[PDB]
């Protein structure tokens, strides 16, 4: 399964959402700057807990 | 299917892996303080693209 | 009760705003670059508690 | 219906847990050090389009 | 005595300002792009004391 | 009236509070590292709009 | 001796360079957007000791 | 007139206060770890305005 | 070639050391608390050019 | 092997890519205003583990 | 040996290159706006050691 | 001339001091954890400008 696209860097929005659309007919493609937001791999076995001083649960848990 | 434990927000960290681990036997329990990371819903429809000032991509599009 | 609208996720503004609105007649629609703030989830259960170094309360707790 | 507290703003933890907890039996309390997230007022009336370079929606539409 | 404005979220510059000059002549507007600064309630009563590493006071101390 | 105390920079915490108090018995005193939060001028005759990409309020706006 | 404006806030640039000069004749303006930088009070009898994690003095310390 | 240390870096709190309230008997002497603010030299000649969306001056100008 | 190790995912340092140093003896292992730093892949065929407001070179540009 | 190109700065755009793919054809040029991202030098020997509050693993090991 | 200009401070750009290469012809005059990066004191006798959670060196240490 | 030491990666504080004070006797050793400040490559040849709104001069220009 594809989902990662390393040979569409150096490349124009216009290609890229060609190719992508040929692969994955459903994306849905969005256009942002460098450095706009920080993403992260999802991982679907992981499950972060985020606590708070006393080391309870502070944020809802959720899979990635 | 469950993906999120809004059920644990408040508990302990072992009463959240107790749960978590009856839900998910798979799960790589991860315990972070509150603010380490900015945490994203992950889109599986979704690419973006991260163009540079030419509207080139200037990073891997992946799916997420 | 619909408080999401993940199917508006690629589209324009202006298809947006319609389906919000529709959905939602009274809906006070802002349009902001991704990236501007870091929202969060309301939880109505949840009050948060901010301390200062000697454990005292240093903001006005409130419920989210 | 109460939902700030100003009144404990300088008390300890301890008298703000039992202070809350009679105005608001279900609260789910969470401890943290100022400055760790940066709150925000929910406004049920609200809703926030995060858009990308396109002015396309980048994230799923919430109430808040 | 008034000091915000809920009614104004969604309206437009022109609309707030006309608003809040009839309610608070002496207004001086400032205009800003959303998050551009984090601002924070005033709380007359109280007084923040930010401390160095050895707990002596390193700012001045200010109400608010 | 005294809003601020220039004369305790450089002091212990145990005199910054003694110090205080006696000019501002109401006080609610608050400790924290340098650096937690930036803390801002209030200013009684301000409003600050902050507006989205349209130019519409997108915050509730409040003296200050 | 006037080392602040607090009556230019929410005047125009034109208006404050002309009130500026005629105090401070010498004084070299600069026109930057809220939030760019976080200026800071200089405080002449402090100075500042930055030290690293053995509490050695890591940057040079000057008085401000 | 001396108004910086470089002599002190790489020595110990002890040795620079010592070295320090030779130079300037009246200095209040804060310890801090590096990277907690940004400081920033003073320039007695310098007024910086910070200016909003229409250029209307957003803080209170001050030398430095 | 081996550059990654999803498998550790969960693990403790002992045993990540273990596996990291079998498949590649000359790891030289860094150990740092999540969001330290924000680390980025690596791309062999890219050259980042960043620029200053007239588009010239800012800083020495190298492949990665 | 050339993988930095010093010569470079003060250079436009245009001069550089004109260098860079004379050295290195195949370089795939992207063009980012400064301060966008915090670029670092990757080190083919060095593995770093980011750690969560217990010491285990968090995110995936990679080389660089 | 010349390496500061603060004659410069609130002169043109055009003004302030003139200056700048007559004094040092070999420039590489870089123009960037206020905030885009934090600049930093090069001191050619001090080296900075970047550690781990282990106190092993992390970065590579470098003269400044 | 000797000025980074990329051999020391991934050895402790005491061996990186003897290393870099037999090839650097007069080196004053700063011990930082990671992510502490972002430090910056020295470029002899380069003079940053940094800018106002109006293209003026805003801060000292100095080498490097």
Same mark, same amino acid.
């Not at 696209?5 to 700057?33: F, H, M, N, T």
């Not at 999802?42 to 809802?60: C, Q, S, T």
């Given at each position: ?41 999802? *991982?679907?076995? *992981? ?14 848990? *959720?899979?990635?």
């Amino acid at each position: 399964l594809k989902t990662e696209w390393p040979e569409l860097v150096g490349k124009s929005v216009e290609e890229a959402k060609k190719v992508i659309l040929q692969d994955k007919p459903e994306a849905q493609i969005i256009v942002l700057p460098v450095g706009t937001i920080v993403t992260m791999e999802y *991982r679907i076995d *992981r499950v972060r807990l985020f606590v708070d001083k006393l080391d309870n649960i502070a944020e809802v848990p *959720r899979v990635g």
